[PDB]
């Protein structure tokens, strides 16, 4: 999705095996190696495309055209911000006008506000890194019995021996 109109994918009732992600050029959690030990009420994956020099704006305490007018994250945000270069996917010669961002607004956005009430990105394959497109996914963690949890590991079953067992807890 365009950053001015970012989309939210809701993740629920499943196993969040975060090792498929952790093990991207940016992987900053607000510990990334302990994600598999946590349960959540919900996990939301907010998907959008921005410029390289705008990636730094996708964080708590940050300001700027994206942070203030397109995609705002709260100072008390809990979750992970993951991003990677998409120069060979979202760029066109002359500028890919499919992706747009808000340049002007009367006031700043609230956290996770989606205002689609607008300028195109000049995304080109020959742009400098700061002006290349990046695909950004922000995983917001909502902390119910919880429906999103990490994977369980297992061994095997050994019989006719004294063993220390754990059967589903």
């Amino acid at each position: 999705a365009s950053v001015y109109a970012w989309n939210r994918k809701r993740i629920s009732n499943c196993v969040a095996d975060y090792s498929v992600l952790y093990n991207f050029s940016t992987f900053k959690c607000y510990s990334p190696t302990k994600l598999n030990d946590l349960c959540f009420t919900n996990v939301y994956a907010d998907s959008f495309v921005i410029r390289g020099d705008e990636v730094r704006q996708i964080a708590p305490g940050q300001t700027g055209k994206i942070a203030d007018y397109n995609y705002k994250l709260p100072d008390d945000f809990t979750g992970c911000v993951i991003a990677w270069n998409s120069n060979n996917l979202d760029s066109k010669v002359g500028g890919n006008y499919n992706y747009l961002y808000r340049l002007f607004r009367k006031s700043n956005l609230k956290p996770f506000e989606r205002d689609i009430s607008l300028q195109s990105y000049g995304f080109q394959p020959t742009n400098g890194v700061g002006y290349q497109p990046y695909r950004v996914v922000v995983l917001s963690f909502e902390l119910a019995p919880a429906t999103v949890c990490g994977p369980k590991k297992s061994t095997n079953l050994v019989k006719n021996k004294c063993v220390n067992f754990n059967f589903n807890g």
Partner: antibody
Amino acid sequence: QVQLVESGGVVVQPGGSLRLSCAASGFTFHDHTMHWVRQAPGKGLEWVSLITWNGGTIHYSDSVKGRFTISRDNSKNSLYLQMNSLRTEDTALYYCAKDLGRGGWYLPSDAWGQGTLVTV
Amino acid sequence: QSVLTQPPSASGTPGQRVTISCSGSSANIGSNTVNWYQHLPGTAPKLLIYSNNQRPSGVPDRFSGSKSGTSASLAISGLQSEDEADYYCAAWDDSLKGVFGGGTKLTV
């Protein structure tokens, strides 16, 4: 990544004419208003003219009004300035610049080209 | 030989703050907005401030301005040696078209 490239910075005899050309890329061309600004040597910036995206309106500074013509070709992503009845007073560094955004207009914004030198 | 009036120069010690004033008629500032440019010798002018107090991408919060009455000003704080540039005041006029001032030379 907005780029503007000027051409036509040549020396012309007074009483003659010269056309300047600005190539544009890195942004939507056909929806944006564009402006020309010139800087005479030893002086500050002097505004020349603007043409809107649809040709809806054109404006000239009095010193060039009636003698300069501004036009654009949205199929080539290019802006042109035709300056006739030239005087030695028109010697200046000419810059190509775009406005702040689409549709409307005011003054030249952040993206300026390097410019080219016009001598009369 | 200009409509918008500015001082010829400004100066100060790095780390300090200076201001550059701009004035004109009600048809220049009073009924319109004021933009500012920072022109570094060797290249083109770039937009610094627009619509009185807004900034374009790439311009830090050390640069700000305001408009009141029939006058306007640019404030430059945290002076750096890299800001030794000519600053310009511009506005759209009701009688004339695009109006630029003489420019103010800011030096270390």
